[PDB]
From a paper:
The Nudix pyrophosphatase MTH1 or human MutT-homolog 1 (Nudix-type motif 1, NUDT1) is a DNA-damage-preventing enzyme. It recognizes and disables oxidized nucleotides through removal of a pyrophosphate from the damaged nucleotide, which subsequently prevents their incorporation in DNA or RNA. The substrate recognition site is adjacent to and mostly separate from the catalytic site and in MTH1 it contains a hydrogen-bonding recognition element in the form of an Asp-Asp motif. This motif is unique to MTH1 within the set of human Nudix hydrolases and is important for substrate recognition.
To further highlight the variability in the hydrogen bonding patterns seen with the Asp-Asp recognition element, we discuss here the structures obtained with compounds 5, 6, and 7. Their binding modes are shown in Fig 7 and it is interesting to note that none of the fragment binding modes resemble the binding modes II, III and IV seen in Fig 2. The binding mode of fragment 7 (mode VI) exhibits a positioning of the Asn33 residue similar to that seen in the 8-oxo-dGTP nucleotide structure, whereas the residue is flipped out in the case of binding modes Ia and V. The acidity of the carbonyl group of 7 (pKa 4.1, calculated value) suggests that it can exist in the keto form, consistent with the expected keto form of an 8-oxoguanine base. The distances to the aspartate oxygens (2.5 Å and 3.2 Å) of Asp120 suggest a strong hydrogen bond.
Author numbering: 3 to 156
Write the structure that this text describes.
Amino acid sequence: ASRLYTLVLVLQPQRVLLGMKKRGFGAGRWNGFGGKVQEGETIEDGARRELQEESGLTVDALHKVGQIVFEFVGEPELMDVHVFCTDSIQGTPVESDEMRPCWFQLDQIPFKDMWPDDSYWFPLLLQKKKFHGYFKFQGQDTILDYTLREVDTV
Ligand SMILES: CNc1cc(=O)[nH]c(=O)[nH]1
């Protein structure tokens, strides 16, 4: 019982682009760009589409970097999140009524204002590692348990 999602991190050598969601799921937190995958759409095309819809950026090359399954206790649907990374983009990040994008220096990533799981896997992403993860949450702030391992193939 899992639903596909995408998550894209525009990660350059000294900085990463994050977006502050204004409403809905995860509002008030800095996050990568993504959302649900459409019927008849590949996960990668879904990731490219969501990056444009949410950030206004056009991605050329996308690299798979991780897979993370999220469980929210009491919610039937598991989120199967396919994480991607890019250093090659076109355009300038667009602020919209839904999203406020901002570039962060790598030593200044706002972990306290991000989903709690990011403190676990962002260190791997920053060191160009690939990973498989699972996080069980109680509500939106508490991680009850988790698993996270590095992999050669996502
Ligand atoms: C539930 N955890 C996460 C959801 C999401 O959209 N992005 C994260 O980094 N983590």
